[PDB]
Amino acid sequence: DWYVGTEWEDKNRGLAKKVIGLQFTEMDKPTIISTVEFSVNKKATNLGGRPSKYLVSDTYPQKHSLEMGTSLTAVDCYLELLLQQFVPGETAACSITTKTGERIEFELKLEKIVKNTQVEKLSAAEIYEVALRLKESGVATFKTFPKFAFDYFVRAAKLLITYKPFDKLTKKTNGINGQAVEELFIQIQTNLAACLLQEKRYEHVIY
Numbered sequence: 001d002w003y004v005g006t007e008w009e010d011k012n013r014g015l016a017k018k019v020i021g022l023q024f025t026e027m028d029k030p031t032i033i034s035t036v037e038f039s040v041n042k043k044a045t046n047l048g049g050r051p052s053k054y055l056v057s058d059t060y061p062q063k064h065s066l067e068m069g070t071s072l073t074a075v076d077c078y079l080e081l082l083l084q085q086f087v088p089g090e091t092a093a094c095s096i097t098t099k100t101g102e103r104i105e106f107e108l109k110l111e112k113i114v115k116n117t118q119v120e121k122l123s124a125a126e127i128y129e130v131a132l133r134l135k136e137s138g139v140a141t142f143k144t145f146p147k148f149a150f151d152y153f154v155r156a157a158k159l160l161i162t163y164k165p166f167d168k169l170t171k172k173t174n175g176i177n178g179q180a181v182e183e184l185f186i187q188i189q190t191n192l193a194a195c196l197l198q199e200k201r202y203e204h205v206i207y
Contacts, residue, residue, distance in 0.1 A: 008085050014097035017082055020107075023089030028113060030084045033130055035067045035115040038083055041091065041107035048102070050075050051144075055106055063111065069134055069155070072141050075104065077148050086110035124163050125175030128184065131156040135188055142191075142198065150195040157188045 001022070008017045030036050040062055044055040052075040054064055068084070071077040075096065082094050091109040098104070122130065138152030160181060163169060169178030 003087075003090070010081065013078065013081065015078060015082060016095045016097070017085055018093045019090060020093055021091035021109075022087070025088050027087055028116065029087060030068065030110070030113055031116055031118055032084065033068055033117050033119060034084075034113055035065070036083060036113050037063060037065055037111040038086075039063045039109045039111055041109060044104060044106040046102055046104050047075075048104070050104070052076055052079075054079055055104070061109070065114070069130075069152075070137055072137060072144070074145050074148060077145075079108075082108065083110060088112050119159070123175050124169060124181070127159055127163065128176050128181060131159045131184060131188075134159070135184070135191065138188075138191060138195075142195065146195050146198045146202075150192065150199070153188050153191045153195065157185065157192070160185050160188070 003022045003024075004019050006019050009015065040054060040060065042060045043057050044052075047055055047057075051073045053071070053073065054066075055075060066080070066083065068080055071080055078096050082092075086092065086108070088110050091107065094106050094108055096104040119127075119130075134152050134156035138149045138156065141149040141152065163174075163181060166178040166182040166185070169176060169181060171177050
């Protein structure tokens with residue numbers, strides 16, 4: 001065994017991964033816009049009341065379909081980032097450390113990558129739909145997780161400005177009308193503004 005025991009970290013986000021098993025098929029990793037299938041191998045420990053679509057218990061192991069950039073909770077969003085570090089067939093002990101130092105611990109396996117689209121490949125039309133879905137997740141997490149909501153809108157905005165100017169876009173050439181793009185960009189800018197106000201409203205409310 002070579003891959004077993006190897007480790008990855010993102011100190012900034014309190015994420016750590018340690019490989020415990022591998023059924024090798026290839027060294028491909030999920031992209032930021034991929035669709036994957038993965039399983040939770042046992043009950044997550046120390047969830048501590050935090051909402052999670054995948055880790056929240058109520059039989060193991062259990063399978064899930066996941067499209068990157070759709071998660072609506074803090075834990076789930078960070079689940080995605082861990083999954084983006086798996087190769088298919090890999091089983092890893094994962095952890096999310098909180099501000100209080102307490103660790104949420106879980107064991108995941110990436111079963112396969114259903115679709116591994118690359119951003120660079122995408123047409124302007126397809127980029128729009130990715131920006132549109134990201135904004136939707138932003139809107140859906142606005143009340144419950146404003147920092148993540150914010151990050152969503154930022155990600156959506158960043159995708160779109162790759163096509164500035166917008167005035168040179170036509171359905172005929174790019175697949176999409178440049179008017180639709182600048183309208184969606186403006187909606188996102190407005191959402192980021194709202195988010196900052198939402199964060200202010202609760203900065204002095206304790207966790």
